[PDB]
Symmetry: D2
Subunit: 476 residues, 4 copies
């Protein structure tokens, strides 16, 4: 029950950061004021697997101030802010397993430790807060392999590891089963539900739900309007250049920036690059998104067409093998490559790092310089992992306030309906009125005056004076 | 049946414009190349009620080249381009009833004439293309009043006219029933379906469908992605400043522009005003839209807060009484007021024009100068009706190509399934693949290179290499 | 001697436009309020040669309200607004010779008529307001050729006409000398001075002054901060897209726009195209301007590199042969070509129009469609002349207010120092304090609150609390 | 000959940064390739007083590679990058006295140490590179007080210290004179000249030159086009948000940002804030700049009008007392205040820090939180000193390349003309051709293709095919 952090003496620095960011998160603060003295999450055991940053610390503190017990780990080996981990590990009923620059082996250990609440009966959490689906994955795969072992006596061999991170994952599961072949099966049965924060995690849930593999309720927090339209757009508009500037200090204006993918994240990234004066190039597979990109003055092309002159290459597709080895080998000298989508699959950093005749030179934390066979030296950020969270501090508190408000409401609704049959083992979405509520909490801070709908106006539009004001199909 | 247009000698000028805009509508031209020699709409009787512009002429030509017969009218008394009406009235199997500056009495006469195909059995059309729902309204109200007369022997009295335009509407219906009390009831029975082009028309359809008043199938073309995301946004970004410039020639940069409503149209309008250097103020009733407005650098306020210093006031709410008489009376000298939403309800132009001590002075077509009681002189555009179509030429052909492609596909699908039970008396949406198809047709013209999804990438995303690439809930 | 205009019955329409634009020119209106009842220009004879637009009419009215007599003509054969010419010709002591679509022969006739005040002694004006230097040219060339005839008995032969417009010019001078070989020599002697409005006219004056050919004082109004920084930038940002929209109605967003020249005009043009969503490409010869263009996100290339995919080609160089015949022949179908710089030298429209196998088809006034040898049809605006003034109404009133305020001050200072030796036969610039004065007059209209410099702040900066606040070398 | 730096072990980290930034400074690298093996600065003793950053390290290395000996110090107590100082102190013939977070006493010690080359005859440098004029100040004041002491036997008393930093300055001078009352007088006599980098330093030089106090030649590097138009604009566009983000991590979009001053720096700052989506408010004393601000969509107001709702307050005036104590006391909770202009005079941080009832709490390096009397807690950056260099890393290498190229050329020209009478004790500027030269060096890196002027075009414009292309009065 002892937290594991880099250095507990950073707690005060983290505490100061939390106190300040409090004014930047009017949404979360409003939640504490309403459901505060009520303690609606009293006795609830919540395990979280989300970037251990300052904004995340304020989410933890909100959940615990709501009366819940928490075990937490980071969902990325570089996103953890040590001062935030130390500060949060100080709270009562909160245990944390996270630190910056953790190895892949240590990463899975933290996820497992966060999901394990002691031993024996009720060894798992009541609810899960995931960001990418790693905690959810471990549970589902654990249950899957435990059944395979109880039938064919077969264990997950890290031999068939199609990746280094997968090797540690399979190793963790193999050792887990050899210690207690029913651990995950018993835990999964007590889980009320999970709430997914990102597009990638939702994609995983949808595929499991499609094949009826979901063991418990899953709430799609990422598809909430006040999340995908704010977090994914305005957040990346902020943290992309921030991560690029801290990592390289290079000029962006007048430079050729290549953005792969023009969905929510791509739109946000491109907007900030355009405002700085960069020459934006977009790659896309979806014709609808491509036209949106062209209408903003961007040039839509295939990577092969611009890979030779590109100064910055940012992937925001949430797909795999977007920037292949053959592309990296053709880049100009001093080209910068980073991924802001998911894991490290978008860019074949591994293939490049293990290529014959490649020299890897570390410039600073999360920043490496690779010497290509032809002599060109390119820059790779966070070894292909989230550059905004690895080279910077991720989204600003004000943006994360929207996301964490939806997360909190997801946990509240899941816990308050645990004794009902409102939720099955499927993916659900938060109601429309909650989205408007979250938005309403941030209006004052923004000095935005909302107009009151009149009686005639209400009848004409066919809506209530309090909302919702749009239909469920509205795209905003 | 003979066409009724201003001057048929303008046909040549219109013909030249159509030939040129042909290159700007690759979408429509692609349709002619595929379903051309097939004549899928052969023997179909289509009645249209949409702005009679050059872009609309190319839509008519496409429908007739597909084998259909057409009767058409404009949906606005100022939007008709006489040279386009003359040109289209020239085509075989096409009859037109439209001209610029038509009176309200003449307007309804045109709608009725367009919907009436001869006399006796089968006196109505097979399908309807509407833009605002006026044709659809006439038919539904006609059936409603015809039943009221067949039961209580009561006729629609233009006495209870809550408006001048409504007076002519009720007068037209009263006369219609005194001539044939079953005209509309019999016509509504043969209508396969209608396809709505704008947000206002869809709102009308949704309300009727909510109360189960729909007499036939209705396709929501406005809610199609390649329409609400392109037409409503990029179209207005183009035609708002164009309408403002031609009507007043005033400088926009440095001026205080007040935009009411920040939905699709509002976002498009604000983007162009921002690009020109204006100081944009936004009014909103929806908190979610309000935050989007603030995140773009716009100040969100209530009209009462800025009505005194505003230089331009543009309504894009699609609501009623947004700019009341009390607001107009407080505006500065030379302030410009225009509506780009629906009809003339957004702004109380009528209340102002009939106010005691008000002097109305016509400056030029669709532009009037009003002298307020305090002596201030303000400028009102198109008497509160669509300023972009009244003072300019509406959206450009390239944008209308997306909308008209969805319209054509809507007519095609509706006609090809007339003998099936695919569509009931409800509001439907065109399939996802069609939206991507439409987008694909315009990529070449835009020099946009789409990327081909790989085999691994397809399985990972769980989509087909040809699309759709997004889920039905995707907001783009 | 009466005015010569297209149709005097348009006077009322023009009057209405002048009354409204009055609120858009707080600068000129302030001048009338200060030097109004004083009549400082009483008895002064002013000849003007500037675009006869509504904004220009308000300048004429201001000069006459100051007590001067005026004879005016347009400096371009397409820029005249007939309703403005009719309205201004109505004023007392104002004679106008201008109309839209005048032939080159008629053009010079108007210039000569405007410069000729009766007959005999004092046959010329006291001061001149030029825009391009045509009136100034005629006087200088007239004096030059009159001396050549009085010595070698040689006359200007229109045979050596290196251009059609030059032929009419030499023809006019030849006839002028065969009627009175001392007309211009005597007129030039009574001219107090001239004030140049545009960059091109200033270039002409500087070359004459360099070779000591100036016969009278010339004031460089164009190099005035509140002119080149406002008019050339913000004015073009407004009239470029307006001219393009009225002439073609084509979509600009997503289109490839090629701007040649990135000086004051180019910067303004590009800013508007960028705001609309176009993909901007810039051509430059000056490396300093080229970097400015790149830092704004624009791609700097040579015409040859983009002439194949360009949708719009706009020249703003003020140079000759920027877009040669070889370039025009390689343009895509439906490509638009227009000049916004000087005369019709920037684009080789003449070479193209007289090329073998070329078909010219008039679409509408100032808009022609040319069929290239390969079949491609391109659009040419105003036959290579100012597209913003030919296809639209030029800069808005508010922007012209700054230029015309500097013009009025130039005329006032020139007339008030006619009996002094403050000005020689050289090019002078208006003092710094006047530039700030002009700017100050427009602040209230813009709701801009200026800050008052404090006592300590004044000493520190070493400036007066009233200005100037910058040094003469400041670039703003 | 012993450098004084924080930790010499950071040398390798600094070296890696220098090697990378080399590719971002094609201008400086070109200088090394041309005047490299020539060693034009051989035996020259250069003392610099400029922000000891990585970009500065590359400038030092260039000067030494040119054959010069260097002694260097920082011109700000927070701008020094320790890893850069350590790396540069490694070079041969280079001595450095600088470190981050130095006290004011230590600051002047470094300046003095940098200007002192040994002892006895020739105890000073041959040339000086200044940024703010502190080194130049020390020398001029030193000579002034040395004469005052040699006449009235009066010493500079730190009693009359109108500031803490001035106290240390006068103390340094007093001790200097009590040790050798002719030190500075003798040194000033051997100084060939100095080259000023910033607007503030130039203002100081101009005031001395105006009163004939200049002891040696001064080159105004800041007024060079490729410096004020690139560095001051594009550099701040980059380092303003960067400093803001690293110091607070606060969201900028949708926030109210108040920029005081709209000159070169203000224009750059506002452009980046606008691109991020902030609501920009500008304060100005100059009417011309105010109109430029309004034409970009910004609201011009007096501080008193917005000081209550502002979220960020940035001063770019280069003036004194812009944000007084009475303004700071009225700011909202969590408001951020920072100066990017000169020293710490723009904002009365001192008055606030010494105000009764004020609590100062350090959040992190260069970031303090002040509790106001009414309880509001505001954030002050770098205690009123350059926030971009104190909270971040200043301008990016590519921008600094333009500035340092002009510096190098300034040193080269000054040293090559030391035995001539080309330069007097006045302020001079670099020739136009050099500005274009510097620009040309960076075109390739930017993928910008310059167009070659044609023979006819050259004669028409009256310029050489190689430039200059503009007149000295051109404002760009
Ligand atoms: N780092 C952060 O702070 C942050 C914040 C939110 C989301 N994310 C992550 O960002 C990624 C994308 O998120 P999103 O919400 O924008 O989802 P999205 O589905 O809206 O956007 C993905 C886009 O990529 C395009 N695409 C797919 N494969 C492509 C390929 N090979 N080449 C070019 N384009 C391709 C699609 O057409 C689509 O428009 C996910 O991995 C998500 O979880 C990161
Ligand atoms: N003239 C054109 O070319 C054109 C093109 C497309 C749509 N339109 C019309 O524009 C209108 C709006 O269209 P939209 O598609 O943007 O729909 P929308 O529903 O997406 O946008 C309307 C917005 O106005 C807001 N709103 C409603 N009442 C308001 C009030 N009283 N004050 C302030 N804001 C209010 C809503 O919250 C919403 O965000 C409709 O009338 C539609 O038919 C015109
Ligand atoms: N139509 C209008 O409303 C309006 C308003 C103001 C000025 N103008 C005219 O516009 C022209 C330019 O004006 P400006 O004030 O911007 O002057 P400018 O001197 O500031 O700009 C000219 C620019 O063109 C560039 N250039 C020259 N030849 C070139 C070539 N062959 N290719 C590419 N670039 C080239 C120069 O390097 C320079 O940057 C003049 O003709 C002027 O009279 C028209």
């Amino acid at each position: 029950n002892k937290s594991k952090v880099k250095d507990i003496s950073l707690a005060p620095f983290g505490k100061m950061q939390m106190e300040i960011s409090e004014n930047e998160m009017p949404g979360l603060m409003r939640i504490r004021e309403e459901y505060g003295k009520d303690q609606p999450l009293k006795n609830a055991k919540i395990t979280g697997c989300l970037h251990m940053t300052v904004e995340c610390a304020l989410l933890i503190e909100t959940l615990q101030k709501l009366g819940a017990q928490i075990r937490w780990c980071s969902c990325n080996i570089y996103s953890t802010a040590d001062y935030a981990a130390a500060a949060v590990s100080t709270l009562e009923n909160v245990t944390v397993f996270a630190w910056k620059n953790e190895t892949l082996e240590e990463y899975w250990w933290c996820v497992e430790s966060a999901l394990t609440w002691g031993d024996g009966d009720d060894n798992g959490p009541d609810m899960i807060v995931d960001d990418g689906g790693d905690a959810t994955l471990l549970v589902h795969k654990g249950v899957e392999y435990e059944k395979l072992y109880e039938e064919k006596n077969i264990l997950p061999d890290p031999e068939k590891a199609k990746n280094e991170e997968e090797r540690c994952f399979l190793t963790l599961l193999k050792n887990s089963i050899l210690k207690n072949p029913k651990k995950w099966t018993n835990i999964a049965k007590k889980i009320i539900g999970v709430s997914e924060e990102t597009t990638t995690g939702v994609l995983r849930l949808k595929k499991m739900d499609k094949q009826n593999e979901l063991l418990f309720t899953a709430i799609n927090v990422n598809d909430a309007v006040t999340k995908q339209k704010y977090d994914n757009v305005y957040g990346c508009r902020h943290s992309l250049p921030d991560g690029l500037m801290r990592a390289t200090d290079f000029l962006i204006s007048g430079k050729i920036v290549v953005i792969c993918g023009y969905g929510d994240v791509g739109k946000g990234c491109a907007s900030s690059m355009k405002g700085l004066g960069a020459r934006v190039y977009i790659t896309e597979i979806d014709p609808i998104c491509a036209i949106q990109a062209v209408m903003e003055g961007f040039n839509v092309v295939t990577l092969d067409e611009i890979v030779d002159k590109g100064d910055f290459f940012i992937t925001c597709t949430g797909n795999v093998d977007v920037i292949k080895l053959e592309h990296l080998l053709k880049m100009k000298n001093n080209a910068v490559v980073g991924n802001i989508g998911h894991f490290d699959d978008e860019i074949q950093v591994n293939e490049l790092f293990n290529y014959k005749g490649i020299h890897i030179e570390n410039v600073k934390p999360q920043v490496d310089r690779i010497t290509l066979p032809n002599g060109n030296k390119i820059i790779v950020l966070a070894r292909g992992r989230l550059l905004n969270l690895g080279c910077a501090t991720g989204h600003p508190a004000f943006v994360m306030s929207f996301s964490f408000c939806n997360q909190t409401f997801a946990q509240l609704d899941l816990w308050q309906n645990k004794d009902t049959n409102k939720y099955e083992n499927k993916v659900y979405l938060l109601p429309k009125h909650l989205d408007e509520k979250v938005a309403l909490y941030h209006l004052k801070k923004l000095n935005a005056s909302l107009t009151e709908l009149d009686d005639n106006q209400c009848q004409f539009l066919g809506v209530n004076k309090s909302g919702p004001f749009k239909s469920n199909e509205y795209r905003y």
